[PDB]
């Protein structure tokens, strides 16, 4: 669950860019090179419809049983403090997309990449969710779960 997985500066730069600078909305990560480096798979502009998020990722997954990490800084709204109606907080959620049937070789690197990116990407206090199928990544879970822990 932890090993010498290389963290890339570019994707980390993108984290601050999306989270604080709101230059981007989401960024997908994958393990690049044999020397194992976590790097950008796909970045999305600040205005990115939920449909396009699925679309862009959908096409790159069909090659095989691929595992991809997704960190998205999205502002969902609740009814709470701030204003009586809409309490909006951008909670950058980390949703790792990987079926269990993924190749054990990559699976091991994947598992050892978890702790590495967890703290190192500034996702220390942020939530980490797992999704194995494209049906499960539907807002029915992701939107609902994140909406609660916006201020929790």
From Swiss-Prot:
<keyword id="KW-0009">Actin-binding</keyword>
<comment type="function">
    <text>Depolymerizes growing actin filaments in muscle cells; required for the assembly of actin filaments into the functional contractile myofilament lattice of muscle.</text>
</comment>
<dbReference type="GO" id="GO:0005737">
    <property type="term" value="C:cytoplasm"/>
</dbReference>
<comment type="similarity">
    <text>Belongs to the actin-binding proteins ADF family.</text>
</comment>
<dbReference type="GO" id="GO:1990904">
    <property type="term" value="C:ribonucleoprotein complex"/>
</dbReference>
<dbReference type="GO" id="GO:0030838">
    <property type="term" value="P:positive regulation of actin filament polymerization"/>
</dbReference>
<dbReference type="GO" id="GO:0030240">
    <property type="term" value="P:skeletal muscle thin filament assembly"/>
</dbReference>
<dbReference type="GO" id="GO:0030043">
    <property type="term" value="P:actin filament fragmentation"/>
</dbReference>
<dbReference type="GO" id="GO:0051014">
    <property type="term" value="P:actin filament severing"/>
</dbReference>
<dbReference type="Pfam" id="PF00241">
    <property type="entry name" value="Cofilin_ADF"/>
</dbReference>
<dbReference type="GO" id="GO:0051015">
    <property type="term" value="F:actin filament binding"/>
</dbReference>
<dbReference type="InterPro" id="IPR017904">
    <property type="entry name" value="ADF/Cofilin"/>
</dbReference>
<feature type="domain" description="ADF-H">
    <location>
        <begin position="4"/>
        <end position="147"/>
    </location>
</feature>
<dbReference type="GO" id="GO:0015629">
    <property type="term" value="C:actin cytoskeleton"/>
</dbReference>
<dbReference type="InterPro" id="IPR029006">
    <property type="entry name" value="ADF-H/Gelsolin-like_dom_sf"/>
</dbReference>
<dbReference type="GO" id="GO:0030042">
    <property type="term" value="P:actin filament depolymerization"/>
</dbReference>
<protein>
    <recommendedName>
        <fullName>Actin-depolymerizing factor 2, isoform c</fullName>
    </recommendedName>
</protein>
<dbReference type="GO" id="GO:0040011">
    <property type="term" value="P:locomotion"/>
</dbReference>
<dbReference type="GO" id="GO:0005865">
    <property type="term" value="C:striated muscle thin filament"/>
</dbReference>
<dbReference type="InterPro" id="IPR002108">
    <property type="entry name" value="ADF-H"/>
</dbReference>
<dbReference type="GO" id="GO:0009792">
    <property type="term" value="P:embryo development ending in birth or egg hatching"/>
</dbReference>
């Amino acid at each position: 669950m932890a090993s010498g997985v290389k963290v890339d500066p570019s994707c980390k730069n993108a984290y601050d860019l999306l989270h604080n600078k709101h230059q981007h909305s989401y960024i997908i990560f994958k393990i690049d090179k044999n020397d194992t480096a976590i790097v950008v798979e796909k970045v999305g502009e600040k205005n990115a419809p939920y449909a396009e998020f699925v679309e862009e990722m959908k096409k790159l997954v069909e090659d095989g049983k691929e595992c991809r990490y997704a960190a998205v800084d999205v502002e969902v709204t609740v009814q709470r403090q701030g204003a009586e109606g809409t309490s909006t907080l951008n909670k950058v959620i980390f949703v790792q997309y990987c079926p269990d049937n993924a190749p054990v070789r990559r699976r091991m690197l994947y598992a050892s990449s978890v702790r590495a990116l967890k703290a190192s990407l500034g996702l220390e206090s942020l939530f980490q969710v797992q999704a194995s199928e494209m049906s499960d990544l539907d807002e029915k879970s992701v939107k609902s779960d994140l909406m609660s822990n916006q201020r929790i």
